[PDB]
Amino acid sequence: HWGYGKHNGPEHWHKDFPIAKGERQSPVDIDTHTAKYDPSLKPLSVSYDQATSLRILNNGHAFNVEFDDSQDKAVLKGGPLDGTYRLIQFHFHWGSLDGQGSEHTVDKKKYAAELHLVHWNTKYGDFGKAVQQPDGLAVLGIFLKVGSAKPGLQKVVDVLDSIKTKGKSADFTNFDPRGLLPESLDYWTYPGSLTTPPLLECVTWIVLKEPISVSSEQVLKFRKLNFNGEGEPEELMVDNWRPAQPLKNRQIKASFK
Ligand SMILES: [N]S(=O)(=O)[C][C][C][C][C][C]C123[B@@]45[B@]67[B@]89[C@@]1%10B81%11B698B746B814B562B%10%1143
Ligand SMILES: [Zn+2]
């Protein structure tokens, strides 16, 4: 099955998922000089005050913090979006070392990690229907650099020991994702895809310019997770990022001057 190794990594995905070589694949390099300021873009509205986290899951490729998405409790709107998008989960991508780990790059710079807050368009009723639509998902991407600790991340870090291996989950209630946001909501946006199989071309990407800082100790704990299941040969969960894909016939727009 697909993963991040020599024999099953991103360069192989196209055999099972031919859309891997499609016209709107993610991630991409953001060339900051070429991205056009678009004065028609609105401020992003991130309304997470009523967010209800439920659980954290090691799915064998990352860990997902899952939310109750059975009502409009945690929603993204505005920015480039029409309508209302409901938070379903967040997860990260990260490296074996601090010099790599992000999926998007900024003028070819790789960050240590990248947070993806995944939301689906309520007009399609459920996540599974939304991923079949070109405007089905909105993913808010946030870069992580290593420096000062992010206090709002520590609750996530401390539960990782309990979900070391693939298929393990843990109750994860009352986690506030507002504690993962940078100060500024300045962003870039473009049309793209899921960055993992099935690589569906259903995402409006919103990538924040301002990174968050996390400590070396925090990211080291991400790197103790395992891709393998319990009792299997240990394969550290590191380098679970897809590299930048061809931009093709797309424009990246900036919300800021
Ligand atoms: N890295 S990222 O932020 O671009 C991606 C996060 C998207 C979550 C989408 C995966 C699935 B799993 B369930 B439902 C969706 B349909 B079925 B299975 B298929 B896979 B696809
Ligand atoms: Zn992701």
Swiss-Prot record:
Mutagenesis / variant outcome for changing L194A: Reduced CO(2) hydrase activity
Per the UniProt entry, the effect of T196S is: Enhanced p-nitrophenyl acetate esterase activity, but normal CO(2) hydrase activity
Superkingdom: Eukaryota
* Positions bearing Phosphoserine: S162, S169
Reactions listed under catalytic activity: hydrogencarbonate + H(+) = CO2 + H2O; urea = cyanamide + H2O
- Where this protein primarily resides, as one coarse class? cytoplasm
Per the UniProt entry, the effect of E103 to A/Q is:
Strongly reduced CO(2) hydrase activity
Enzyme class per UniProt: lyase
- Amino-acid positions noted as binding Zn(2+) in the UniProt annotation, renumbered to this chain: H91, H93, H116
Known outcome of mutating N64Q:
2-fold decrease in enzyme efficiency, as determined by kcat/KM ratio, and efficiently inhibited by chlorzolamide
Domain Alpha-carbonic anhydrase, residue spans:
1-256
Q: Which cofactor does it need?
A: Zn(2+); Co(2+)
Q: What is the effect of changing T196H?
A: Higher affinity for bicarbonate. Enhanced proton transfer capacity
Mind listing the UniProt keywords for this protein, alphabetically?
Acetylation, Cell membrane, Cytoplasm, Disease variant, Lyase, Membrane, Metal-binding, Osteopetrosis, Phosphoprotein, Zinc
How is activity influenced by pH? Optimum pH is 6-8.
Summarize the impact of V118 to K/R. Strongly reduced CO(2) hydrase and p-nitrophenyl acetate esterase activities
Outline what the protein does.
Catalyzes the reversible hydration of carbon dioxide. Can also hydrate cyanamide to urea. Stimulates the chloride-bicarbonate exchange activity of SLC26A6. Essential for bone resorption and osteoclast differentiation. Involved in the regulation of fluid secretion into the anterior chamber of the eye. Contributes to intracellular pH regulation in the duodenal upper villous epithelium during proton-coupled peptide absorption.
Q: Which family does it belong to?
A: Belongs to the alpha-carbonic anhydrase family.
- State any further remark: Target of drugs used in treatments against glaucoma disorder and breast cancer.
Q: What is this protein called?
A: Carbonic anhydrase 2
Q: Which organism is it from?
A: Homo sapiens (Human)
Q: Which gene encodes it?
A: CA2
